Write a protein that binds this ligand. Sequence first.
Ligand code: CLA
Ligand code: CLA
Ligand code: CLA
Ligand code: CLA
Ligand code: CLA
Ligand code: CLA
Ligand SMILES: CC1=C(/C=C/C(C)=C/C=C/C(C)=C\C=C\C=C(C)\C=C\C=C(C)\C=C\C2=C(C)CCCC2(C)C)C(C)(C)CCC1
Ligand SMILES: CC1=C(C/C=C(\C)CCC[C@H](C)CCC[C@H](C)CCCC(C)C)C(=O)c2ccccc2C1=O
Ligand code: SF4
Ligand code: SF4
Lengths: 137, 152, 82, 63, 73, 26, 80, 731
Amino acid sequence: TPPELDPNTPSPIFGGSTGGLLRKAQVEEFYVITWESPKEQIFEMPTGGAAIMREGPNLLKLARKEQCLALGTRLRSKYKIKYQFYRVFPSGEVQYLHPKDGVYPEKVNPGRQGVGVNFRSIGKNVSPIEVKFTGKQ
Amino acid sequence: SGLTPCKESKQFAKREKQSIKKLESSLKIYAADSAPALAINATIEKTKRRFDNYAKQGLLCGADGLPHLIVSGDQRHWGEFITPGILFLYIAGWIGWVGRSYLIAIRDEKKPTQKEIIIDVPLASRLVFRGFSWPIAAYRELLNGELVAKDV
Amino acid sequence: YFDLEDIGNTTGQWDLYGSDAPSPYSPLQSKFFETFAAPFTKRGLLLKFLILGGGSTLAYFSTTASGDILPIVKGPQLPPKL
Amino acid sequence: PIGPKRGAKVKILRQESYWYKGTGSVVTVDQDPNTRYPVVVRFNKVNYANVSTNNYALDEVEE
Amino acid sequence: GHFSRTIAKGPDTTTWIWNLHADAHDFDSHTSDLEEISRKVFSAHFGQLSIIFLWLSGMYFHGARFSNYEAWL
Amino acid sequence: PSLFVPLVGLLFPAVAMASLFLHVEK
Amino acid sequence: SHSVKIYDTCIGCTQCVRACPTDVLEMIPWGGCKAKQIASAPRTEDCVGCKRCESACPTDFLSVRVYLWHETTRSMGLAY
Amino acid sequence: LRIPRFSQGLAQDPTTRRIWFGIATAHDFESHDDITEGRLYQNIFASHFGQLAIIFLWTSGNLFHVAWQGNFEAWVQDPFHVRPIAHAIWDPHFGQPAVEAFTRGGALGPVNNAYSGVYQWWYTIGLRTNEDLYTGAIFLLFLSFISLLAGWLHLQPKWKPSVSWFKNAESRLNHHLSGLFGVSSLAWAGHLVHVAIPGSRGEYVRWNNFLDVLPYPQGLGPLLTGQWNLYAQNPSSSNHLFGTTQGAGTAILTILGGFHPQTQSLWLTDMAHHHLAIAFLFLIGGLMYRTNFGIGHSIKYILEAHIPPGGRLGRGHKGLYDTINNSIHFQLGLALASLGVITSLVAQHMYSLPAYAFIAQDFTTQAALYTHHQYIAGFIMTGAFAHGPIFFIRDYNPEQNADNVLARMLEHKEAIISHLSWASLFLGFHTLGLYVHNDVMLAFGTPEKQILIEPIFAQWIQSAHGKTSYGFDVLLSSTNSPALNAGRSIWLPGWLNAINENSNSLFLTIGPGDFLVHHAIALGLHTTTLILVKGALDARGSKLMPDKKDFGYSFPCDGPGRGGTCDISAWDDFYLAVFWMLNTIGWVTFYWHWKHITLWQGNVSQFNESSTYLMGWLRDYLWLNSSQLINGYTPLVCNSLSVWAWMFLFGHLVWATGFMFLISWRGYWQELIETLAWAHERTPLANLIRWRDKPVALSIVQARLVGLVHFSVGYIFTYAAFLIASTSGKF
Ligand code: CLA
Ligand code: CLA
Ligand code: CLA
Ligand code: CLA
Ligand code: CLA
Ligand code: CLA
Ligand SMILES: CC1=C(/C=C/C(C)=C/C=C/C(C)=C\C=C\C=C(C)\C=C\C=C(C)\C=C\C2=C(C)CCCC2(C)C)C(C)(C)CCC1
Ligand SMILES: CC1=C(C/C=C(\C)CCC[C@H](C)CCC[C@H](C)CCCC(C)C)C(=O)c2ccccc2C1=O
Ligand code: SF4
Ligand code: SF4
């Protein structure tokens, strides 16, 4: 799948809060989320309250990644809305995470790679052993 | 047993007199013929009576002037622990045996937990008296008083 | 509305709040201070000078007439059993 | 068609199961060789997670 | 849980018993019907007033038969 | 004599706390 | 960061994924169960370690296990 | 990169968590990065020399201050009517009334009254001058150095030992028994007969004359000839003045038993004889196991051979040798267990059998020492039960221990735990029951209706020891038996004199009040053991968490899933037991102190009646003895007990502070700090400064610790403030 990319989009109406980005964004990382609304609706917005959704591309910048998903998972419910978020970084860069595969993680997809799958089954783990590793490899 | 019996005790005897004088001090302000009067005097006779009974039944009484129970098993003082103890275990087992007998009868069929929160089954068919002879559970022991699922 | 990957700074609170002031200076009296405050500007050298300045505390306590270090005198209590 | 009947009672041998040495009734047993754990089992008592069923490996005793 | 059918359902653990009392007065968790709730709490206030009223009756009664109020007067 | 040492027992925390602070932030 | 593992005792009910708020897990084609799916833990970097995934697992004991390891800002859940 | 260097995963923590955890894991060598069994063993061995260096330095300072700021000499000349001095006080905050009140013991300045009993100890062994104390301080300072020298020496490659060397157990036992125990005891018996005993009699035998002064009139011959009774012909007279050559015998080895009547302490001749006696058993015993000479035993094989046929212990102790020798947690838990037991054995035998001169009359010191060691013994026991689980999790090999006595404990663990529950539930239901019952009638004004069970079993033991109180007619106090006549004078006449002493603490009189408390203590023991073994047997896992083995000894939890899993680790079970341990020792020390301060006042009658109901404890013990304490500093005056009144309140404050970390939990505090992090950022003149470590709430396990530390510190300090002051005030 090819990541779509985000360039410029308008931000939803809100007026400000004290739960926004703070320094971490400047020096480590900050996460942005994009979704399209068929109507200028009203959504809760985590770390604050009441913001108008807007109609169009809709671009929002948040922190922790998790804040974006919470909004996104609420965005998929209530309103039938598709969404995507990325990790901006401080020096440009384009890291796109979620959906990623382009199909939701909960929905099985054809070529993902297992990563950290144990075909032993739990309870068959060993006991140390002063060697490196913990046995739940 | 440095204690000398409540009969030849001067402290335990003194303690009796001390308690009733205080009670007598109270009735002086109510005037006999009155309610608080008997209640005080009824309390006094009970006081005399319990002091009287304790000396009868034995009871050794320490230097402090209060009865000390002997649970060594001494035949002279069996009524102080063993005989009440035998009576307790009897009722203690009886309860234990009746309760166990209940949960067993419930388990087959029905919704077992239904019977536990609500028991519109009283003593089941007739389970209570089964405790009159609980000690015969010794014979339940030689058969299957215990389940063989875990260990022996 | 205004996010620009080009400048990551304005995007964040990178900007100095208007409390910054990069304006002119202060009177020439500085020429004096710069001369006499120089030995304390070195760092590390100053760290040491202040710690060894703790030699003052030793001097001040070795010699101190009015701190309670005397009974002044009394006849002490025995006292519960002597 | 494989080891355990449909209505047979079975003793669990997992060691990590809530019903480690207990007994339970089997729902059914899938026949796909691919399946690591078929032999679904019902239990009278639930575990700390309020589930009554679980799928097990072929290794167990009957009764 | 008497209040709710699934809640009432059946008991499998002792936790059910503790839950039963914990959410006994939690009227807005038994229904989403505002009218049903409001009707519930309004009646509940009556039941309250009865208890405090009974409470008062015992205070006056005890003052009459089991007190020395006259003597204190 | 004994009025010189309990303060160096307090110069020492100043020195120790300073050094350790430099050690832990490095 | 935190260490998460998936076990073949899984049955592919996908509840561990739906529970995760940081998107650490995902479903994978497999031949081990009737669902023919299995959980995966690719993005452990975003894992906070809250064990929401474990409280959704229906397998007799967890098919997904979270082992709290080294702490990072992401794992610490810091927004500052 | 950063601290901790031994843990890279810890060092990369951006938060304040790294500084905390870096400190709390410094001694956990096995968890350090790139740890090897070689590095593990000689880190401990080097850390061992470090501990010895501290002890010797600590003991050196004690000998120093007493020689420099303590009278001692003034104390020696009148041990009864002078107060020992620990050290001088120097505090700028002191007001003039303070410097006033604390000037005691004939000192030029304010000092602290020593309650460690070092004066009695040092005086009894033969220290008479300040000069002697200095030479000891210098010698200990020197001993403290060569310990560090050895520590540094074996860290060097050309002197470092192999792990196998450490695992040669057969030879380490042979030396420790024969040398470390035997010889050192033998050497002490030498100091006793050369210096302590003659110093006691009146002669000053020191380095400049010990070579020319016979310890006994007759030569060393009688020992070598075989006739050793000659060392007991002329013992010290009963009416003997210590440090005075009055009524002083010649014998250096006796068995008199009982106490030296003036000092109320055990005879030095008995002790010189005691250590000599025990040295031998240790000396012969240290030759049991095989080393390099072709004779001796094999521990392994003895463990292997001990298999009872026909069940019921299974493989017995096979492979158990290697399980212990390969696991130093087993060894430590086994060591703490033994040490913890005899630590109480010290406490019990040192108040009943005072070893030092004029220590029995120092009531504040006697109470302090007992209370001291019981809490020390307490914590040690919780450690033996703590390294137990750690052994199971980190070093236990189930297969190598197949069906042996150790592996049989895990397979019937539900049996041990449930009966400990029963025994705990039994004791608690009745001990509390009998108490509350007794309080009811005294409230109702009818104390003759109480349940006062006479401890007739224990009183039967007392009569069996020689006490002629009660009518029991048992051994050592009966009419015909092999037991008492086996006395053959010797110990019995001097000892039977000592047991029927109404003054000493040697076998006090016990009654109904002593019955209830002993059950309370029994309740405290069982419950504490219940918590500790349950943590051990479920350390590798339960049914709520079968893979607890995979998470280690200490982890926060396993989450709110499956109903909730708070405090499920073996570490937390320890942490819960520490509370119960403090309660148990608390009851023990309460019981010891109250019964003694009533005895010391010549009023045991108050204890015998007030100890049977719980209001008596709180009023006649807690309330009654607090008056002088809480008036250490008054809105009118200021006493010498002002330190203890302040510390008493101090202990309350630390104690209540722990409650915060134990009740309130992390998620509240973390969210609170997050608001404070926002604040600091948005506050002018403060923006210029930034933190290098991210501010975070303490961890879940850290808080349980920090809270327990506060709880324990305040627990100790409060009672310490009360134990000393209340006893010191009245004396
Ligand atoms: C104006 C009065 C008022 C009213 C009408 C309510 C009503 C309600 N509350 Mg609220 N509450 C109140 C005051 C009130 N509260 C106050 C002053 C506090 C602060 C203490 C609280 C704290 C509180 C909490 C934390 C919760 C509620 C909850 C609720 C809801 C259901 C809970 C329930 O059924 O009770 C259940 C009753 C019990 C579980 C009985 C418990 C046993 C009691 C506490 C022992 C009392 C001891 C007794 C007085 C003395 C000892 C006697 C003994 C020795 C025999 C219900 C809407 C719950 C909710 O979720 O809201 C929807 C909820 O969790 N309340
Ligand atoms: C021979 C004695 C001995 C030895 C050699 C060890 C050795 C060890 N223990 Mg063990 N322990 C012991 C006795 C011993 N213990 C006893 C008697 C107990 C009962 C309490 C314990 C309970 C115990 C627990 C619960 C744990 C250990 C652990 C450990 C290991 C790492 C400890 C560490 O570095 O953390 C660092 C230690 C500190 C940073 C100590 C500072 C904190 C304490 C509270 C300071 C003292 C209190 C306070 C500061 C006093 C100030 C008051 C002030 C007002 C005056 C290490 C092998 C740990 C382990 O094995 O890892 C898995 C572990 O969790 N021990
Ligand atoms: C706030 C008020 C206050 C203060 C600041 C002090 C301060 C002091 N008191 Mg005073 N005291 C006070 C109130 C106070 N006291 C009150 C109200 C009373 C009752 C009237 C007393 C009664 C009293 C007595 C009887 C004595 C003192 C003594 C002392 C001195 C301790 C000697 C020393 O520093 O050695 C070293 C300091 C310590 C050993 C403290 C270590 C404890 C820490 C917390 C634990 C270990 C930390 C650990 C290693 C972590 C490492 C970090 C570190 C390296 C930075 C010190 C000057 C003693 C003295 O005069 O000294 C000769 C003395 O004997 N005080
Ligand atoms: C004669 C030979 C000899 C001797 C004297 C020692 C002595 C010692 N060894 Mg070594 N060892 C030896 C041979 C020997 N070893 C051999 C052949 C090997 C293997 C090949 C080892 C391997 C070894 C290891 C690995 C270690 C030691 C350690 C120790 C020290 C133990 C810690 C301690 O000081 O407490 C000594 C205890 C006592 C002196 C008394 C015994 C305890 C009783 C119960 C106390 C009660 C006494 C009394 C009633 C109370 C009096 C109190 C009063 C005085 C106030 C001790 C100095 C440890 C260490 O390094 O030191 C810290 C340790 O790590 N040894
Ligand atoms: C399991 C509970 C338990 C525990 C841990 C203890 C522990 C202790 N007891 Mg207590 N004791 C108990 C129960 C217990 N006792 C009971 C039920 C009684 C009768 C009331 C006594 C009477 C008693 C006396 C007179 C004395 C002690 C003393 C002591 C201390 C010394 C050891 C001893 O002799 O006791 C021996 C304990 C037993 C022989 C009983 C073992 C536990 C059994 C299995 C409980 C069930 C027995 C059952 C009720 C018998 C039925 C009675 C009858 C109907 C046949 C020690 C702290 C002595 C002490 O130091 O006083 C301060 C002391 O003199 N105990
Ligand atoms: C007695 C124990 C104790 C103490 C001292 C505190 C103290 C505090 N709590 Mg706590 N709490 C406690 C028990 C305690 N709590 C318990 C048992 C619970 C369970 C319910 C709680 C639950 C709780 C909650 C939910 C909260 C607090 C909060 C607070 C803080 C309020 C702000 C403040 O006053 O700062 C001032 C500090 C003091 C008054 C303490 C004494 C200060 C000393 C005297 C001065 C400094 C001494 C000296 C300079 C130290 C240097 C010596 C050197 C050697 C180190 C304060 C630190 C709140 C908070 O976070 O702040 C808003 C808060 O939200 N507490
Ligand atoms: C005599 C006496 C005494 C003693 C006692 C003793 C010491 C004993 C014992 C004992 C013992 C040591 C016992 C044991 C055991 C065991 C076991 C092993 C058990 C069991 C059981 C069971 C099984 C039960 C069951 C049941 C029943 C039957 C009833 C109900 C309940 C149930 C149901 C639960 C004294 C002297 C104290 C007192 C006096 C008297
Ligand atoms: C107050 C509190 C905090 C906040 C505590 C913090 C932030 C600790 C910071 C303490 C400050 C730095 C002062 C402490 C000074 C100490 C005397 C440390 C001395 C230095 C060395 C001896 C270590 C928690 O994080 C917490 C977590 C879980 C349960 C309960 C609680 C809890 O009660
Ligand atoms: S612990 Fe939390 S972040 Fe980690 S996999 Fe589970 S749900 Fe996702
Ligand atoms: S909860 Fe367990 S069975 Fe379900 S998808 Fe996740 S790992 Fe698989």
